[PDB]
Amino acid sequence: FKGLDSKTFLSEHSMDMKFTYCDDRITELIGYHPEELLGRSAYEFYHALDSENMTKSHQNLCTKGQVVSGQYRMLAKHGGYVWLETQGTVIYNPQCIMCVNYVLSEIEK
Amino acid sequence: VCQPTRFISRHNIEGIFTFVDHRCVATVGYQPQELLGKNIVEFCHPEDQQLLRDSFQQVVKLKGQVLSVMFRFRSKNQEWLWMRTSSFTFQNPYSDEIEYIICTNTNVKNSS
Numbered sequence: 001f002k003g004l005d006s007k008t009f010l011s012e013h014s015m016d017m018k019f020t021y022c023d024d025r026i027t028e029l030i031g032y033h034p035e036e037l038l039g040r041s042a043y044e045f046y047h048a049l050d051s052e053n054m055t056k057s058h059q060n061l062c063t064k065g066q067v068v069s070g071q072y073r074m075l076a077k078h079g080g081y082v083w084l085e086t087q088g089t090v091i092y093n094p095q096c097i098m099c100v101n102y103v104l105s106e107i108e109k
Numbered sequence: 110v111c112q113p114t115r116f117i118s119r120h121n122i123e124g125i126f127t128f129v130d131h132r133c134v135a136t137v138g139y140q141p142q143e144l145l146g147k148n149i150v151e152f153c154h155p156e157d158q159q160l161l162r163d164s165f166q167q168v169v170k171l172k173g174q175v176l177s178v179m180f181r182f183r184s185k186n187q188e189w190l191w192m193r194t195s196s197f198t199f200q201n202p203y204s205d206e207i208e209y210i211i212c213t214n215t216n217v218k219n220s221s
């Protein structure tokens with residue numbers, strides 16, 4: 001059992017969805033070091049069955065300025081997937097996207 | 110394109126830094142530890158301090174929408190730098206824990 005903050009990590013993205021920053025909390029949860037995520041698109045990490053829905057959510061985010069993702073599966077560093085949900089926000093100067101990510105499951109292989 | 114210099118911070122609703130992204134060193138010259146535990150107002154020009162307090166008060170009322178504010182931030186070299194802080198609240202609805210404020214802080218120009 002984990003507390004809320006231990007299951008939450010913030011990421012930042014350019015408008016092409018590439019990671020430009022990630023909280024170190026992601027390492028304990030999903031396995032990645034933040035440095036290895038930089039320059040990779042969010043889309044590289046979504047489960048195939050969630051990819052079309054995530055595209056729609058990204059479109060809604062860019063159109064409206066904010067979005068709540070619904071539940072989706074993110075690829076974990078050492079195989080398998082973790083369920084999580086994300087609140088996304090565009091910061092306009094569009095400059096970048098901020099995502100607050102909350103983990104909903106253990107890694108499932 | 111020349112990338113903006115910015116860093117992320119988390120604040121409690123009073124304005125105290127509870128998390129500081131290390132990109133702050135390049136943006137304003139302080140180590141994260143020099144900001145953590147202090148109120149953002151402690152780095153703000155006297156003429157802007159009340160606006161900054163007001164902003165933190167209002168972002169909590171705006172239903173998780175983004176508020177922005179422009180203010181003068183005292184860098185590590187004791188120089189006033191224009192910063193645009195864009196802030197929004199995060200509350201995890203699986204809980205009734207108090208919301209905190211997420212900020213992205215960018216050095217900007219006070220000009221057209």
Ligand SMILES: O=[N+]([O-])c1cc(C(F)(F)F)ccc1NN1CCOCC1
Nearest residue numbers: 013042057058061067069086088097
């Ligand atoms: O990047 N983004 O624009 C992301 C947007 C998003 C949305 F649109 F809110 F559904 C959900 C997830 C997004 N990025 N992920 C990628 C994997 O790690 C968590 C953050």
